[PDB]
Design a protein around this ligand. Sequence first.
Ligand SMILES: *[C@@H]1O[C@H](CO)[C@@H](O[C@@H]2O[C@H](CO)[C@@H](O)[C@H](O)[C@H]2NC(C)=O)[C@H](O[C@@H]2O[C@@H](C)[C@@H](O)[C@@H](O)[C@@H]2O)[C@H]1NC(C)=O
Length: 228
Amino acid sequence: ATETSFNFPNFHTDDKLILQGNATISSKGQLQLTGVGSNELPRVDSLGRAFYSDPIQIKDSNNVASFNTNFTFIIRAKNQSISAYGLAFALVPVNSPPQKKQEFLGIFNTNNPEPNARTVAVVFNTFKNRIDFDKNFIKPYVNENCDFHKYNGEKTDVQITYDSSNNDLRVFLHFTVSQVKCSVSATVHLEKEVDEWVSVGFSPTSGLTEDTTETHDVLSWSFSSKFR
Ligand SMILES: *[C@@H]1O[C@H](CO)[C@@H](O[C@@H]2O[C@H](CO)[C@@H](O)[C@H](O)[C@H]2NC(C)=O)[C@H](O[C@@H]2O[C@@H](C)[C@@H](O)[C@@H](O)[C@@H]2O)[C@H]1NC(C)=O
């Protein structure tokens, strides 16, 4: 097998998922990335990551996989205007452990390029209020403004595609009730950024205070890699 495909209409404990840091599945079937404390309130300065347990094959040899992933989430904060830090969809080395917290979203360690992070991520930067497409670097390759401070607090549907033919990544975000849309596009050669097999999933980090913290819950997720 070269082609992977799964579908979580909701989450459960017995699922093919690897949870790291404070991430847990709620009794309602929700993937709570940054977690909830003993008093059931969002955790401050919390990091939680979660990946499909099977590694995914990006490079077959010469042929690169194309992929399509759809997921929907909700970020709820006490004060969204000051919410931090965000949620990430990332391709990482297979058993990589969580990196740094805060603005590092648990996927990076430095303010400098990390060519050996072998990570490619799409961050819904709730801190800086934009959508970032990061390539082995915490500083975005291409970023687009998206008003999370205003439209968060509602199901948001994300759709991410990668076509190895034109080597383009396309992200389409849609806030479901406010109806607001955001999107960014970049030209990437996945094969030059990540390994032949990677772990696919999410990683979020919450603010260092009761006011700046928020939730990062994923309510559903689908994925399909394809070797054409
Ligand atoms: C998971 O949730 C905990 C909060 O509900 C995090 O602990 C908090 O970490 C702060 C420093 O990052 C520290 O000042 C807080 O006092 C502490 N709160 C509690 C209740 O422990 C936890 O962070 C990890 O665990 C703490 C104890 C420290 O050792 C940190 O260095 C750890 O990262 C959250 N994050 C993770 C990744 O578990």
